[PDB]
Design an enzyme around this catalytic site. Structure first.
Site, mmCIF file in Angstrom:
data_model
loop_
_atom_site.group_PDB
_atom_site.id
_atom_site.type_symbol
_atom_site.label_atom_id
_atom_site.label_comp_id
_atom_site.label_asym_id
_atom_site.label_seq_id
_atom_site.Cartn_x
_atom_site.Cartn_y
_atom_site.Cartn_z
ATOM 1 N N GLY A 147 -8.862 -0.884 0.965
ATOM 2 C CA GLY A 147 -9.218 -2.124 0.262
ATOM 3 C C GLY A 147 -10.707 -2.331 -0.016
ATOM 4 N N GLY A 199 -14.252 -3.678 -2.011
ATOM 5 C CA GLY A 199 -14.750 -5.037 -2.216
ATOM 6 C C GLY A 199 -14.269 -5.933 -1.090
ATOM 7 C CB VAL A 252 -6.135 -3.068 2.753
ATOM 8 C CG1 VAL A 252 -4.941 -2.149 2.753
ATOM 9 C CG2 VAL A 252 -5.791 -4.422 2.197
ATOM 10 C CG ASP A 292 7.403 2.369 3.931
ATOM 11 O OD1 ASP A 292 7.332 2.763 5.122
ATOM 12 O OD2 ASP A 292 8.466 2.057 3.375
ATOM 13 C CG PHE A 293 -0.404 5.214 2.993
ATOM 14 C CD1 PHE A 293 -1.473 4.330 2.907
ATOM 15 C CD2 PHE A 293 -0.549 6.483 2.446
ATOM 16 C CE1 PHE A 293 -2.644 4.697 2.253
ATOM 17 C CE2 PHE A 293 -1.730 6.870 1.811
ATOM 18 C CZ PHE A 293 -2.784 5.977 1.733
ATOM 19 C CG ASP A 348 -2.828 -10.603 -8.655
ATOM 20 O OD1 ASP A 348 -3.532 -10.684 -9.697
ATOM 21 O OD2 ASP A 348 -3.275 -10.233 -7.547
HETATM 22 C C1 LIG Z 1 -5.412 -4.843 -2.234
HETATM 23 N N1 LIG Z 1 -3.991 -5.045 -2.125
HETATM 24 C C2 LIG Z 1 -3.231 -4.127 -1.388
HETATM 25 N N2 LIG Z 1 -2.442 -4.336 -0.282
HETATM 26 C C3 LIG Z 1 -1.829 -3.183 0.176
HETATM 27 C C4 LIG Z 1 -0.931 -3.211 1.391
HETATM 28 C C5 LIG Z 1 -2.091 -2.002 -0.557
HETATM 29 C C6 LIG Z 1 -1.537 -0.618 -0.351
HETATM 30 N N3 LIG Z 1 -2.260 0.469 -0.657
HETATM 31 C C7 LIG Z 1 -1.693 1.691 -0.469
HETATM 32 N N4 LIG Z 1 -2.508 2.859 -0.753
HETATM 33 C C8 LIG Z 1 -3.623 2.815 -1.710
HETATM 34 C C9 LIG Z 1 -4.371 1.644 -1.933
HETATM 35 C C10 LIG Z 1 -5.451 1.635 -2.872
HETATM 36 C C11 LIG Z 1 -5.760 2.789 -3.565
HETATM 37 C C12 LIG Z 1 -4.987 3.982 -3.326
HETATM 38 O O1 LIG Z 1 -5.263 5.162 -4.017
HETATM 39 C C13 LIG Z 1 -3.943 3.991 -2.401
HETATM 40 N N5 LIG Z 1 -0.408 1.883 0.000
HETATM 41 C C14 LIG Z 1 0.367 0.805 0.287
HETATM 42 C C15 LIG Z 1 -0.165 -0.480 0.106
HETATM 43 C C16 LIG Z 1 0.675 -1.730 0.333
HETATM 44 N N6 LIG Z 1 1.288 -2.671 0.557
HETATM 45 S S1 LIG Z 1 -3.148 -2.496 -1.741
#
Ligand SMILES: CNc1nc(C)c(-c2nc(Nc3cccc(O)c3)ncc2C#N)s1
Lengths: 310, 252
Positions: free
Chosen positions: A21, A23, A28, A92-93, A137
């Site tokens: 995350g 900025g 995150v 989950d990533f 959003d």
């Molecule tokens: C900023 N808002 C977000 N919340 C979550 C939880 C995010 C998120 N991000 C990823 N991976 C990711 C994030 C940003 C750039 C990138 O190349 C990969 N995976 C799961 C989540 C969720 N939920 S982003």
């Protein structure tokens, strides 16, 4: 002398990896489950300013992630505690996010792959709307793609449930660039159509590789929109002349739709252009919905939508 | 999942509280008490009976994990109500909930100067507790109450305006007076409430064109054996509650 807690694990079971995350938006982190290696995303629930207990906005989002279970919607695995304390949403990533790819000059999409992306995204939209939820959003950045090429809609922080009556919803929602006419004109009785407007901006971004209308203020935003979609006429948009913010923000009226013309360059496919044009429609009532969009000849012509590798 | 928050009779006997020496008879009392506190406060704060009920469920569930000996009903109730209100989109100000909880538990006491350390502390106290509730419930706050299913049924049984009111009366009371919500799904409990509402009013609903009793169209797991045993249990405790039954007694 602390207490029982069978249903809320300590977040320490995950090992933190690296702040995704940027900025400092969210705080995150990427993490790795300490035992199984399973990768996840952790969002901390902020509440530096909450003086009213647990943030009601958190409660909402949580209610919503709990409800939505679908192949194209990011998955909340659970919520974790810290043990002074704090609270973490655990997801989950997802390997990539659409904004990161569209900005990367090396990355490249075929017409076939783009079709697939739009298809998954529109499917996700169809689903959450079926479920009475507005995302509010829509943006490239909020759209993730898993290492295996499945798209996930993400970030329900601003999302909210909706229904039928006259609706009285919060207006200043959605990123400026991706915000639809309705809202800018002060609509509070809006619905699913606002998400589709978003989808439009993103679809176009698939070729232009860059957010298409980047206004500085609402005045400016609405300028740009008129210079692309034509100008807001009770003729073109029946009953637009009923908002107070209509003549108290008047924008120029010698303006005709260049949606197809101005994008003709970046998009080759007559179909892809036609679909975009049906999404970026002024009157929300006349704007295409997810169901019809999925049925658009764009998804049923050559090249057919393909899998994702590069 | 579907079974987390539902317990067998044996599990209900082995409550966290029985573990600290609390009689099973006593415990039910602690529950009813809280429910009342919730009801009284909820009404003075002018929230919906829905929220009152959502708070009441949170309470019942909380006390299948936590013991009464460690968290007193007079502490949990206000916390849980504060929460339910936020969840049901009828949010009440933290200061305002504290104030009402005070005068409810201390009609006599003098309300503290909001500037006091002793007041600042009790604000923080509520908030801590609301957190302890969330983590106890594992953030599962979407409730479902028999009431929804009441209308659905009563309507489709074609029962007078009056019969229907008595049915919700049964609903709201089964929440204060029993642990049915911990053992049976809102839908099943609704049949129990309607069954008794009929017995109380001498309404009988005749068998479908098929020979199938109404309830089957609301839930096929349900049986007369069950309904009869359950309404008996519910009716018994109503008879125990002063003035409760008076509220629906056909005085004419
Ligand atoms: C900023 N808002 C977000 N919340 C979550 C939880 C995010 C998120 N991000 C990823 N991976 C990711 C994030 C940003 C750039 C990138 O190349 C990969 N995976 C799961 C989540 C969720 N939920 S982003």
């Amino acid at each position: 002398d602390s207490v029982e807690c069978p249903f809320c694990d300590e977040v320490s079971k995950y090992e933190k990896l690296a702040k995704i995350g940027q900025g400092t938006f969210g705080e995150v982190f990427k993490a790795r489950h300490r035992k199984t290696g399973q990768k996840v995303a952790l969002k901390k629930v902020l509440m530096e300013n909450e003086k009213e207990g647990f943030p009601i906005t958190a409660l909402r989002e949580i209610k919503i992630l709990q409800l939505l279970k679908h192949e194209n919607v990011v998955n909340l695995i659970e919520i974790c505690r810290t043990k002074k304390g704090s609270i973490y949403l655990v997801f989950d990533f997802c390997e990539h996010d659409l904004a990161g790819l569209l900005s990367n000059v090396l990355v490249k999409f075929t017409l076939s792959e783009i079709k697939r992306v739009m298809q998954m995204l529109l499917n996700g939209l169809y689903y959450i709307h079926r479920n009475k939820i507005l995302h509010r959003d829509m943006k490239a950045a909020n759209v993730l793609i898993t290492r295996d090429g499945v798209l996930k809609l993400a970030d329900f922080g601003l999302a909210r449930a909706f229904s039928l009556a006259p609706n009285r919803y919060t207006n200043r929602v959605v990123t400026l660039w991706y915000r639809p006419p309705e809202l800018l004109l002060g609509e509070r009785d809006y619905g699913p159509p606002i998400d589709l407007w978003g989808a439009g901006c993103i679809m176009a971004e698939m070729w232009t590789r860059s957010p298409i209308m980047q206004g500085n203020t609402e005045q400016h935003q609405l300028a740009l929109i008129s210079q692309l979609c034509g100008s807001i006429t009770p003729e073109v948009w029946p009953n637009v002349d009923n908002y107070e913010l209509y003549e108290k923000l008047e924008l120029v009226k010698g303006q005709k739709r260049k949606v197809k013309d101005r994008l003709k360059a970046y998009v080759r496919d007559p179909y892809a252009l036609d679909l975009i044009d049906k999404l970026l429609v002024l009157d929300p009532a006349q704007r295409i919905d997810s169901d019809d969009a999925l049925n658009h000849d764009f998804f049923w012509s050559d090249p057919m939508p393909s899998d994702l590798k590069g | 999942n579907n079974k987390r928050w539902y317990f067998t009779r044996e599990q209900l006997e082995n409550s966290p509280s029985r573990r600290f020496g609390v009689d099973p008879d006593k415990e039910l009392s602690y529950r009813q008490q809280a429910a009342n506190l919730l009801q009284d406060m909820g009404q003075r704060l002018n929230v919906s009976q829905l929220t009152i009920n959502t708070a009441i469920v949170y309470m019942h569930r909380f006390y299948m994990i936590q013991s009464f000996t460690r968290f007193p009903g007079n502490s949990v109730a206000p916390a849980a109500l504060f929460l339910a209100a936020k969840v049901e989109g009828q949010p009440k100000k933290l200061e305002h909930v504290i104030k009402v909880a005070h005068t409810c538990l201390h009609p006599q006491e003098s309300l503290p100067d909001t500037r006091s350390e002793a007041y600042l502390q009790q604000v923080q106290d509520l908030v801590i507790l609301e957190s302890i509730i969330l983590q106890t419930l594992g953030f599962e706050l979407t409730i479902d109450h028999p009431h929804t299913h009441v209308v659905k049924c009563t309507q489709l049984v074609r029962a007078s305006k009056d019969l229907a009111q008595t049915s919700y009366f049964m609903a709201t009371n089964s929440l204060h007076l029993t642990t049915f919500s911990l053992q049976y799904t809102p839908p099943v409990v609704a049949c129990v409430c309607i069954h008794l509402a009929c017995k109380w009013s001498n309404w009988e609903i005749p068998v479908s064109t098929d020979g199938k009793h109404w309830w089957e169209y609301v839930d096929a797991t349900v049986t007369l054996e069950l309904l009869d045993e359950l309404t008996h249990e519910l009716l018994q405790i109503l008879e125990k509650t002063p003035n409760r039954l008076k509220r629906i007694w056909n005085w004419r």
